[PDB]
């Protein structure tokens, strides 16, 4: 196709520039901005009129002048070239490779915003994911097609947990009723606003265990242009959707820090002078985060799946901050790290009491994990809650001297935190985690363990805490 | 051990050369196709 250029630049201020004429530019189109020195910038048409179009420049507007700057159309809709050989590669967050290898050959050019999934075309997420972490797999299990964020603080080890989940995540089809050779599984990893140190950590982690071969990495650095942080999850989810719904891959998507993405979104919105929100964030931030998160799921008639684990840093550990609040309003549950458990040296510091997996109740049972999974999880939650509410009353009362059965739960709570939650870098299987849970269930079979009625006691009770 | 790495790199370069060889015949056909497509 021929190339048309617009030289009618009439106004530049901040990140916006106005092009007169240019009524041929469609709304939302991607344009190339070329200055007098031959440098080419990117831009997106955010508002088009008969008199002029408004373009938001991707980078800074430094060096642009009204005399020599020219704007040309690239495409009416932002698109990403995708193909199956993206696995094992790395990208900068705008699709450009940063692994040193040559660019991929595009098999398809999909729009990066995607399209909404028809609710009648979806199906219920029904197959669990073994992350290797007991406090997730047993009590907040991840299901193929779920979106389940990890809520963490600024000082908590969220990157380490993300890397561990990326390394350890597996389908476990052998336990499944539809026993079969493992279906293709892949991990799409998106890093947003990441530092060079964290980037080195992630590259080393993915290289040292060969997980990179079944992975696609989108890596947006903290010093990269702010628009690339916006576009990075679009590219990641476009690749994930392509793989899952055109090659039957089970794709797990990890978004490293949605707080950085939301800061970038606030910056862009304030640049466009939108109506503000609760704390300066755009009023439409819910819609944008929804257009990112809702792309996960399982589709009827297709074997593939998309699973999302967005990690975000809660500012000042405030769960009522706009970022975690909207993310919880969109996603099906959350995993919340505890700073107190981190102070006690426990890793991963997942606090099971405020964590929740909404899709858990239909992802576990017979033909999926083990038949005792849900009852065991209910019992563990009840017993840990009882131990915590005993130790909180001890502080107010100031008396260790208390009823005998209370001391069994305090000891149970301590052993639970020190053995079940505290697992280090161990890649526990679901069977191993259930064995550890049943060993921890050293409470009375009937006088205690009464929150959930179960006859699995005769089958699994009596374990004596013995570790490997 | 080193032998596995050496064998892998040797077979990798060999098959890279093989793919180059089996592209060599169709290079000019692809060039002609692109020339006929670019020109109006």
């Amino acid at each position: 196709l021929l190339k048309k250029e617009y030289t009618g630049i009439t106004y530049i201020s901040g990140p916006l520039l106005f092009v007169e004429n240019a009524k041929d530019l469609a709304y939302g189109a991607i344009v190339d901005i070329k200055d007098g020195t031959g440098r080419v910038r990117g831009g997106q048409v955010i508002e088009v009129s008969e008199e002029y179009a408004v373009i938001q420049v991707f980078e800074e507007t430094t060096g642009l002048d009204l005399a020599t700057t020219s704007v040309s159309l690239v495409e009416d809709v932002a698109r990403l070239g995708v193909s199956k050989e993206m696995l094992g590669r790395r990208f900068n967050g705008i699709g450009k490779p940063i692994d040193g290898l040559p660019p991929i050959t595009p098999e398809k050019r999909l729009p990066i915003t995607g399209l909404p999934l028809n609710p009648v075309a979806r199906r219920k997420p029904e197959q669990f994911i073994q992350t290797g972490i007991s406090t997730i797999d047993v009590m907040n299990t991840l299901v193929r097609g779920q979106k389940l964020p990890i809520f963490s603080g600024s000082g908590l080890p969220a990157n380490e947990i993300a890397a561990q989940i990326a390394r350890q995540a597996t389908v476990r089809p052998d336990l499944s009723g539809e026993g079969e050779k493992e279906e293709p599984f892949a991990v799409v990893f998106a890093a947003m606003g990441i530092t060079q140190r964290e980037l080195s950590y992630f590259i080393q982690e993915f290289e040292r265990t060969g997980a990179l071969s079944r992975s696609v990495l989108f890596l947006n650095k903290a010093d990269d242009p702010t628009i690339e942080r916006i576009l990075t999850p679009r590219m990641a989810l476009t690749v994930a959707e392509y793989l899952a719904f055109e090659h039957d891959y089970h794709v797990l998507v990890i978004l490293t820090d949605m707080t950085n993405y939301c800061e970038a979104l606030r910056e862009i919105g304030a640049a466009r002078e939108e109506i503000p929100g609760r704390r300066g964030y755009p009023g439409y931030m819910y819609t944008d985060l929804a257009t990112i998160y809702e792309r996960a799921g399982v589709v009827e008639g297709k074997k593939g799946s998309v699973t999302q684990i967005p990690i975000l840093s809660m500012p000042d550990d405030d769960r009522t901050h706009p970022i975690p609040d909207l993310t919880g309003y969109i996603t099906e549950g959350q995993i919340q790290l505890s700073r107190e458990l981190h102070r006690k040296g426990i890793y991963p510091p997942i606090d099971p009491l405020p964590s929740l997996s909404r899709l858990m109740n239909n992802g576990v049972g017979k033909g999926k994990t083990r038949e005792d999974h849900k009852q065991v999880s209910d019992q563990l939650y009840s017993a840990y809650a009882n131990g915590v509410d005993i130790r909180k009353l001890v502080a107010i009362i100031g008396e260790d001297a208390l009823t005998e059965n209370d001391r069994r739960y305090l000891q149970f709570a301590d052993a639970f935190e020190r053995f079940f939650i505290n697992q280090g870098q161990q890649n526990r299987s679901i069977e191993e985690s259930l064995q550890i849970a049943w060993a921890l269930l050293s409470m009375l079979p009937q006088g205690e363990l009464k929150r959930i009625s179960k006859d699995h006691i005769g089958k699994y009770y009596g374990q004596k805490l013995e570790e490997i | 051990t080193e032998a596995l790495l050496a064998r892998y790199r040797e077979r990798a370069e060999a098959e890279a050369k093989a793919v180059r060889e089996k592209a060599m015949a169709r290079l000019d056909e692809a060039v002609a196709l692109v020339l006929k497509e670019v020109l109006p």
Binding site: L1, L2, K3, K4, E5, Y6, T7, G8, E20, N21, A22, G81, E85, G88, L101, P102, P103, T105, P106, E107, R109, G210, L212, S213 | L4, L5, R7, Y8, R9, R11, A12, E13, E15, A16, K17, V19, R20, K22, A23, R26, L27, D28, E29, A30, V31, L33, V34, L35, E37, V38, L39, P40
Partner: protein
């Protein structure tokens, strides 16, 4: 122990990419020196005509001075001034009515903007 997979994938990727780059160099060198073929006026006529297809009204068309007169049927029909710039080898560009909009049909630009779509077919045909 698993690095062999990375080596084989990297080697195949490098081979295919270098082959495609060589194909690009071959096609860009063959696309060069079009006017040596005496059929060039017949294709550059359509090359200039598609510029007027893009621009509903054009003030002038700009190309290499030797490439100008062959297109002057469109000059008579539309009244477009013919402007000379020898640096604009193998291409036709036009200035819009107000002078703000312009279009360019240089062969290298067409190759650059088409290669992204064409590579999908080229790689499949080549292998």
């Amino acid at each position: 122990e698993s690095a062999g997979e990375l080596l084989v994938a990297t080697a195949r990727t490098q081979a295919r990419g270098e082959v495609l780059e060589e194909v690009r160099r071959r096609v860009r060198e063959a696309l060069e020196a079009l006017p040596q073929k005496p059929e060039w006026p017949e294709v550059v006529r359509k090359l200039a005509l598609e510029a007027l297809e893009a621009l509903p009204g054009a003030k002038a068309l700009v190309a290499n001075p030797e490439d100008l007169p062959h297109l002057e049927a469109l000059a008579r029909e539309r009244g477009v001034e013919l402007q000379a710039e020898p640096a604009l080898r193998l291409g036709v560009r036009a200035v819009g009515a107000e002078g703000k909009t312009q279009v360019e049909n240089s062969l290298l630009a067409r190759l650059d903007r088409a290669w992204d779509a064409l590579s999908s077919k080229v790689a499949q045909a080549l292998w």
